[PDB]
Design an enzyme around this catalytic site. Structure first.
Site, short mmCIF file in Angstrom:
data_model
loop_
_atom_site.label_atom_id
_atom_site.label_comp_id
_atom_site.label_asym_id
_atom_site.label_seq_id
_atom_site.Cartn_x
_atom_site.Cartn_y
_atom_site.Cartn_z
N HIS A 1 0.96 -1.16 0.18
CA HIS A 1 0.06 0.04 -0.02
C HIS A 1 0.84 0.98 0.20
CE1 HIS A 1 0.22 -0.49 4.38
NE2 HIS A 1 -0.08 0.78 4.53
N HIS B 1 1.62 3.80 2.08
CA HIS B 1 2.16 4.44 3.34
C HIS B 1 3.65 4.26 3.36
CE1 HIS B 1 -1.74 4.36 5.76
NE2 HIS B 1 -1.62 5.54 5.01
N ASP C 1 5.87 3.04 5.19
CA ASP C 1 6.17 1.73 5.68
C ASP C 1 6.22 0.65 4.44
OD1 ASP C 1 3.45 2.09 6.31
OD2 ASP C 1 3.71 0.32 7.65
N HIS D 1 -7.01 -1.63 6.21
CA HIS D 1 -6.13 -0.72 6.65
C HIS D 1 -6.11 0.48 5.88
CE1 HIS D 1 -2.62 1.13 8.30
NE2 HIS D 1 -1.98 0.81 7.28
N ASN E 1 -2.58 2.36 13.11
CA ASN E 1 -2.79 3.65 12.46
C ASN E 1 -4.12 3.63 11.41
OD1 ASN E 1 -2.83 6.21 11.42
ND2 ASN E 1 -0.65 6.52 11.35
C1 XNE Z 1 3.82 4.93 8.17
C2 XNE Z 1 2.24 4.67 8.87
O1 XNE Z 1 1.74 5.80 8.23
C3 XNE Z 1 0.39 5.92 8.39
O2 XNE Z 1 -0.14 4.88 8.49
C4 XNE Z 1 -0.08 7.19 7.96
C5 XNE Z 1 -1.44 7.53 7.94
C6 XNE Z 1 -1.94 8.70 7.66
C7 XNE Z 1 -1.07 10.02 7.37
C8 XNE Z 1 -1.62 11.19 7.27
N1 XNE Z 1 -1.14 11.65 5.87
C9 XNE Z 1 0.24 9.56 7.64
C10 XNE Z 1 0.68 8.11 7.84
C11 XNE Z 1 2.44 4.46 10.25
C12 XNE Z 1 3.01 5.41 11.05
C13 XNE Z 1 2.91 5.22 12.50
C14 XNE Z 1 2.40 3.81 13.02
C15 XNE Z 1 1.72 3.10 12.28
C16 XNE Z 1 0.92 1.88 12.49
C17 XNE Z 1 0.97 1.28 13.86
C18 XNE Z 1 0.96 -0.06 14.11
C19 XNE Z 1 0.80 -0.75 15.13
C20 XNE Z 1 0.36 0.27 16.30
C21 XNE Z 1 0.18 -0.39 17.70
N2 XNE Z 1 1.17 -0.24 18.63
C22 XNE Z 1 1.16 1.12 19.17
C23 XNE Z 1 2.26 1.48 20.03
O3 XNE Z 1 2.40 0.61 21.14
C24 XNE Z 1 1.61 -0.67 21.16
C25 XNE Z 1 1.20 -1.17 19.79
N3 XNE Z 1 -0.05 1.52 16.12
C26 XNE Z 1 0.53 2.14 14.81
C27 XNE Z 1 0.62 1.31 11.30
C28 XNE Z 1 -0.39 0.33 10.84
O4 XNE Z 1 -1.28 -0.07 11.67
O5 XNE Z 1 -0.25 -0.35 9.71
N4 XNE Z 1 1.29 2.32 10.30
C29 XNE Z 1 1.93 3.30 10.85
ZN ZN Z 2 1.58 -0.19 8.48
ZN ZN Z 3 -0.46 1.94 6.44
#
Ligand code: XNE
Ligand code: ZN
Ligand code: ZN
Length: 232
Positions: free
Chosen positions: A85, A87, A89, A150, A181
């Site tokens: 996708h 994003h 990552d 997602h 997220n």
């Molecule tokens: C790179 C990615 O950008 C986005 O998705 C995004 C969305 C919108 C915009 C605005 N234009 C900008 C970026 C991204 C950035 C940062 C984080 C993520 C997470 C994620 C994964 C697991 C968890 C749970 N954890 C939290 C802390 O401790 C315990 C468990 N939380 C988040 C996940 C995902 O879910 O896949 N993708 C993450």
């Molecule tokens: Zn992700």
């Molecule tokens: Zn993502």
């Protein structure tokens, strides 16, 4: 020393590989985003005497480190990459890959979203994936579009030789209490998209989430459960 490597075990900038099955590895890296550190996974699949990469290592420097780690641990060239996708990552690092000789691919949906967001853009479009339930072959994998989850564009990847299902960020690890997220997610369609995955890949033996630990088929039902409860 052999366990699946976790967020506090990987400094930002370093990459580890984990053998999943014969000819299948995950890659694990860590990145900072909005002031917190997160792990993320991708996949490596042997493709004869070449490698297919699924997803970047979440950034340019991480992705350079991934290529170095592959050279050290596996020693076969990465020739193609698919981003699952739009994003960072998944696509952050695509410019690094392209300058290292790797052909980069994503669906047209992912490419459009990456462009609109200002993320790195894979070169080649993957047709045949625009309707939920679509599947296409790509080297040693099958790419599957389950529907919006997602993100609207998320793809999953199956390795038939090993019964490995790489769910990407549409699938969460068993310890997750949250849907991650969700800013670009469809919480209402997500369970339906997971049910499509479950129906299509009933013989999966290993399920790999976008972030966190692999497990078995239970990751799929757990994901549906966490997303429904988040919506609730
Ligand atoms: C790179 C990615 O950008 C986005 O998705 C995004 C969305 C919108 C915009 C605005 N234009 C900008 C970026 C991204 C950035 C940062 C984080 C993520 C997470 C994620 C994964 C697991 C968890 C749970 N954890 C939290 C802390 O401790 C315990 C468990 N939380 C988040 C996940 C995902 O879910 O896949 N993708 C993450
Ligand atoms: Zn992700
Ligand atoms: Zn993502």
């Amino acid at each position: 020393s052999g366990e699946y490597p976790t967020v506090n075990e990987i400094p930002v900038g370093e990459v580890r590989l984990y053998q999943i099955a014969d000819g299948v590895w995950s890659h694990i890296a860590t990145q900072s985003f909005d002031g917190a550190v997160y792990p993320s996974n991708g996949l490596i699949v042997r493709d004869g005497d070449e490698l297919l990469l699924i997803d970047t290592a979440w950034g340019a420097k991480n992705t350079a480190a991934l290529l170095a780690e592959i050279e050290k641990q596996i020693g076969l060239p990465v020739t193609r990459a698919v981003s699952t996708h739009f994003h960072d990552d998944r696509v952050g690092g695509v410019d690094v890959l392209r300058a290292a000789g790797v052909a980069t691919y994503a669906s047209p949906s992912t490419r459009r979203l990456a462009e609109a967001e200002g993320n790195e853009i894979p070169t080649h479009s993957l047709e045949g994936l625009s309707s939920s339930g679509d599947a296409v072959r790509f080297g040693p994998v099958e790419l599957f579009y389950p529907g919006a989850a997602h993100s609207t564009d998320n793809l999953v990847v199956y390795v038939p030789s090993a019964n490995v299902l790489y769910g990407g960020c549409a699938v969460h690890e068993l310890s997750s209490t949250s849907a991650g997220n969700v800013a670009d997610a469809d919480l209402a369609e997500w369970p339906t998209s997971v049910e499509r995955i479950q129906k299509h890949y009933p013989e999966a033996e290993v399920v790999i989430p976008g972030h966190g630990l692999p497990g078995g088929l239970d990751l799929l039902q757990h994901t549906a459960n966490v997303v429904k409860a988040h919506k609730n």
